[PDB]
Ligand binder design. Structure first.
Ligand SMILES: C[C@](O)(CBr)CCOP(=O)(O)OP(=O)(O)O
Ligand SMILES: C[C@](O)(CBr)CCOP(=O)(O)OP(=O)(O)O
Ligand SMILES: [Mg+2]
Ligand SMILES: [Mg+2]
Ligand SMILES: [Mn+2]
Ligand SMILES: [Mn+2]
Lengths: 176, 180
């Protein structure tokens, strides 16, 4: 399992083992983020497990990850949905294709990514992988956005940045 | 360190080593919770360290702890402010003397407490203790309360419970005034 290093432009130039790649000096690599909603339109919010190298124990959107070499973004979502949440989904739809961001977590671990964002509906029940998720909540998107707007610090900076992009919010909202 | 055990009614009966007292079977003991505001009236919110036995990595109010034998509640507040946050404060005011709290954390660890709540002003700069606090923010109380109502599940349950108590909340509000 690896991450894909990107040069100044989004061109892959090689790979790194996933664990070894997230450091205090993380280099730009390829990733995804997705927001999941159930049949009713509830958003799934998850809390990262305390064993995650980056942002452990942090509340964030439904699922995020690292596409492997030759893997489509959409396949990557599907894979991590199965792996982290044991859940089936509908074809992921683009919500924020040009999201790119760098941030530092409270222990100094950095994420540095070209991270296209997706949305999908779940088609099965969750089956939680507690190596990845320690808690989660099904909730109204409206409420989630309010909490992000009032106390953004309570959420992953990654979730906050995506939810505050005007178009991404529209599309998440239109997603219901 | 230890905790002070309380019987079926809130009366002390002795002490228990602190680690050993916090389990899936935690017996009632004494605790405190305090909400701190800077001169500007902003509230300090903190994120519990990942190594805390109970609610690790969770966003919560300013400071909480366990009074020791011979120690007043208000002295315990002073001490943990100093220990956890490196910070000097004004005399703690009692804002919810009757708060009681029993709850299980994400891993099964139980807290079961008589936990009077306080408010105070910080009088010095912070010196965060990373063994106790992994993150923090200075915030407007209004914003914190709005976030708590919108996504209460993202915060420690004690913080939500205290902030939703009517009389306590009025006291937090009073501490948002700017003071010189
Ligand atoms: C964390 C992010 O920077 C927010 Br987009 C994306 C990476 O996902 P990740 O959860 O870190 O990856 P993984 O699921 O494999 O742990
Ligand atoms: C969390 C509480 O149930 C507040 Br209701 C009391 C425990 O605080 P604590 O910070 O965990 O205690 P300590 O600082 O002494 O370790
Ligand atoms: Mg992931
Ligand atoms: Mg404490
Ligand atoms: Mn990464
Ligand atoms: Mn306790």
């Amino acid at each position: 399992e690896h991450v894909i290093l990107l040069n100044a432009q989004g061109v892959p130039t090689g790979t790194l083992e996933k664990y070894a790649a997230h450091t205090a000096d993380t280099r730009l690599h390829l990733a995804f983020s997705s927001w999941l909603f159930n049949a009713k339109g509830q958003l799934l919010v998850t809390r990262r497990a305390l064993s995650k190298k980056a942002w452990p124990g942090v509340w964030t959107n439904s699922v995020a990850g690292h596409p492997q070499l030759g893997e489509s973004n959409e396949d990557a979502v599907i894979r991590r949905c199965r792996y982290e949440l044991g859940v089936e989904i509908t074809p992921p739809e683009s919500i924020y294709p040009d999201f790119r961001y760098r941030a530092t977590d409270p222990s100094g671990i950095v994420e540095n990514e070209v991270c296209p964002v997706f949305a999908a509906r779940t088609t099965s029940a969750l089956q939680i992988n507690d190596d990845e998720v320690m808690d989660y909540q099904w909730c109204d998107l409206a409420d989630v956005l309010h909490g992000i707007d009032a106390t953004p610090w309570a959420f992953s900076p990654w979730m906050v940045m995506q939810a505050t992009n005007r178009e991404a919010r529209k599309r998440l909202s239109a997603f219901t």
